[PDB]
Amino acid sequence: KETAAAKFERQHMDSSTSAASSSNYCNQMMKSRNLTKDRCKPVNTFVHESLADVQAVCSQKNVACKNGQTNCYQSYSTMSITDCRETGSSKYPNCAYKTTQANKHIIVACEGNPYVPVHFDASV
């Protein structure tokens, strides 16, 4: 059974220098990571850092999660990321995405023991 930490790696982890793909990165990535199987996931960020660097964020700046839980953490460093946002014309199961590359501070929710990223909350 897929753990929350494993699901965070599948949905958000793309360790590389930055986005690389043969075509539209977000279309290819959201499909291959199975983020378009039951619905078009409307917004999804990929993080192009090492897993260790992303896991380390669970000990960085504690911030309120958007839902009001208090187990969110903001990276001290900017981080190479790629935002995927569903287009207006995208309708499931023909999901389409616009790709936005950025360097931003990420905000993740962490849980468990070991305390590890389980949710991507925002970037700033």
Ligand SMILES: O=c1ccn([C@H]2O[C@@H](COP(=O)(O)OP(=O)(O)OP(=O)(O)OP(=O)(O)OP(=O)(O)OP(=O)(O)OP(=O)(O)O)[C@@H](O)[C@H]2O)c(=O)[nH]1
């Ligand atoms: O900059 C951003 C903003 C958001 N995300 C997403 O990332 C996931 C985190 O991972 P998870 O394990 O958490 O996965 P899930 O992907 O199942 O989402 P959650 O259960 O956490 O709930 P939620 O945040 O309410 O999103 P939904 O996708 O259910 O739909 P809505 O946008 O509300 O549409 P609506 O207007 O009602 O039709 C989602 O929560 C969501 O935050 C990014 O990547 N980057």
